[PDB]
Ligand binder design. Structure first.
Ligand SMILES: CN(O)C(=O)C[C@@H](CCCc1cccc(F)c1)CP(=O)(O)O
Ligand SMILES: CN(O)C(=O)C[C@@H](CCCc1cccc(F)c1)CP(=O)(O)O
Ligand SMILES: CCN1CCOCC1
Ligand SMILES: CCN1CCOCC1
Ligand SMILES: [Mn+2]
Ligand SMILES: [Mn+2]
Lengths: 410, 410
């Protein structure tokens, strides 16, 4: 049986993870949900606890810790370990009864939980792409120290890439390890994008777009931050850098392709020029499931892909003039050093300014570009605690710099 | 270094194999071409021998054997073993210096060479689909006796399927084994078809199509027999049965899909419902190369697939009313026993009758149907020699029955 912890169990990734676990367990008992962790949502955690009966419960917000204790007395024959804060999270990661940890939290809690999962030599099903973009050097260093820890990608395109690889080769390496691409015979990556809501707008139309336009009648329902990133294609920019770090693929060997039907999730070209791709309806259950079953697969009752009904699949190049965030992401990646940390942090601010109607579409890439221009490369700390501090300090600087640029040219 | 024999080195498969071998060897010395075998083309074989310098040369036709000996004296620093006939073929298959054998011969000599390759525990890169359809039971039995022998598929769709599988699972089994699909977590197959030249034709138009219509300026340039089979979609019907035998996939789990662009070569749905597909320009060099490099891949200088330029990929269901040969193939496969032998043999006759303007389009399916209706199931021989004789006798009976039906109606 596979013993799983879910970090951020009431968010999108967390709820998809529990749905697919529930459905797969109805077919055959394969998963034991050993731990659930949430930020604030105390009642949603109680209902999850009543169904899944995990050995561990944890909540980041200590104000609702005592409430959680009392609600759990209602559940028949159930004596869980009930925890809170970063220390509760550390205790879950260090349990010998947990094999695999799904990271469905963003920002610091996502990086912090990922770090502790790796330090305890766990399999880490990572859906927080910002952690890899901002802290890739630190994650690499940590994975080199903790030899049995593994990151398995959950981000849909990176799961697709991972699914296209031969496990007889994958098992001789691991994600974020130097030479990953060489061992897997990877030549090039087609990184698929939906194109987002603004894909067919003229330059004159793009100048006027608002966050309400991006959020309204969305093709796929997801969080506000990623929805804005999908609109600017900075989601795909971040995913380019994610691809480079996870798979050791050179930036010149990553091609972004707009695939509006969202059936093909990405493709891998091998050194012989044969191309392998992964396909399904747009649904996060498949990527999450594979991260927990890899290197095996298990039966589901998901709807089978009906290719004749789908009928038509399309592919085109993105315009870098319309989506300058893509260009900036490649430039930051190629420059290397901590420029990806700076890209991510400045985008965090610019995204939120646009979300809250403070700046226009092209101001997003303008602010990011200016922050990148204001950063100087730094010698990379050799010590891992120093390296984490260096990343956090650069992240903090870059957010402040974006905000100062906004405040100046108001 | 990979020691390879090519049987039928002057045919389409053989010439494509030597081309990709040549081109890969320019990049890195990977292949040693150890043997070449042709029917009658002494001059062509001499030219191949001058380039590839194989240890063995063999020619079926005895009347050009001495001609071959004297031609080869012109080649500097070269003393090959020069052989003739079925006896030379057997000697090549028993050589300890040969590891992999490409079977690019059709009809009996294809099956006969495959048998000898398997008896000598070789890797057999098999392009002759008719041998799998007709003699699947016999090949399966032989592969269970000779445990180190393997069949690796070269037929493009079956190569695609094979390339979509995890070699960490494939290496626990082999093609044509019972439980192959179970070990590989296969649920269902999408078997891609070009559709041939007649997808837009009405039933009344199909009634009058001729072999010239099927052959003149076709989509893909290939031999006359397969071109006719592509027009009727009996090519795909045979490939359904091939899929069943190679991969132990139930007929209800094989779906034929018309994909006119011929970029996606087939797809595999796994038990979780994730789908993997293999893609490239239509080109036999990739399937041939993978059969010789499996479980590894090597570098080529082939043109990279440009997905944006391709732009659109399409999929639709074939009409069984318009292409009744597909229905007949499924019916024969599902009925089992030696009905696939009968299907293949009757089609051999009907195809050739149509090719020579002796019968009409729907007469092809009419003749095949009638021969199928005229066959009675037989107890399947347990002895491998009795089984081979049983298959050959049924093959001969079915050709004769098809010819008698034609003659009576004529
Ligand atoms: C789902 N995922 O990993 C995303 O990054 C969001 C993508 C893809 C949305 C469609 C999709 C694909 C796969 C699963 C899913 F839930 C939803 C939007 P893009 O940045 O390409 O414009
Ligand atoms: C190539 N191949 O294995 C065929 O069976 C011929 C097919 C496919 C021809 C296109 C093609 C695909 C892959 C390689 C290639 F050389 C050519 C014709 P169909 O029966 O589907 O109408
Ligand atoms: C040109 C804007 N940036 C890109 C990243 O490198 C610094 C400069
Ligand atoms: C209906 C025509 N045939 C199909 C194969 O089984 C025998 C009958
Ligand atoms: Mn993604
Ligand atoms: Mn084929």
């Amino acid at each position: 049986p596979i013993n799983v912890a879910i970090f951020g169990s009431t968010g999108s990734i967390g709820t998809n993870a529990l749905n697919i676990i529930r459905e797969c367990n109805k077919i055959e008992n394969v998963f034991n949900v050993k731990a659930l962790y949430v930020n604030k949502s105390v009642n949603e955690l109680y209902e999850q606890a009543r169904e899944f009966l995990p050995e561990y419960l944890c909540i980041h917000d200590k104000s609702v810790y005592e409430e959680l204790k009392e609600l759990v007395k209602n559940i028949k024959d159930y004596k869980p370990i009930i925890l809170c804060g970063d220390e509760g999270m550390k205790e879950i990661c260090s349990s010998n009864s947990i094999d695999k940890i799904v990271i469905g939290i963003d920002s610091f809690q996502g990086l912090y939980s990922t770090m502790y999962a790796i330090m305890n030599n766990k399999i880490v099903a990572l859906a927080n792409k910002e952690s890899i973009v901002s802290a890739g050097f630190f994650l690499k260093k940590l994975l080199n120290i903790h030899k049995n820890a593994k990151i398995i990608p959950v981000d849909s395109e990176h799961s697709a890439i991972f699914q296209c690889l031969d496990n007889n080769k994958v098992l001789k390496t691991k994600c974020l390890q130097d030479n990953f691409s060489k061992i897997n015979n990877i030549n090039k990556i087609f990184l698929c994008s939906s194109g987002g809501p603004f894909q067919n707008l003229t330059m004159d139309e793009l100048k006027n777009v608002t966050s309400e336009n991006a959020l309204k009648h969305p093709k796929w329902k997801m969080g506000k931050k990623i929805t804005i990133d999908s609109a600017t294609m900075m989601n795909k920019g971040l995913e380019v850098i994610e691809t480079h770090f996870l798979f050791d693929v050179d930036y010149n060997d990553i091609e972004v392709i707009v695939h509006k039907e969202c059936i093909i999730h990405s493709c891998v070209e091998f050194i012989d020029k044969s191309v392998i791709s992964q396909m399904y309806y747009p649904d996060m259950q498949i990527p999450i499931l594979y991260s927990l079953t890899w290197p095996d697969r298990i039966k589901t009752n998901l709807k089978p892909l009906d290719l004749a009904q789908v009928s038509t699949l399309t592919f085109h190049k993105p315009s870098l003039e319309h989506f300058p965030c893509i260009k900036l992401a490649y430039q930051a990646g190629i420059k290397g050093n901590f420029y990806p940390t700076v890209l991510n942090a400045s985008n965090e601010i610019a995204n939120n300014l646009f979300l809250n109607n403070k700046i226009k579409y092209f101001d997003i890439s303008s602010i990011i570009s200016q922050v990148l221009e204001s950063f100087n490369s730094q010698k990379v700390s050799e010590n891992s605690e120093d390296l984490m501090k260096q990343i956090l300090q650069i992240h903090s600087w870059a957010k402040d710099k974006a905000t100062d640029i906004y405040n100046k040219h108001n």
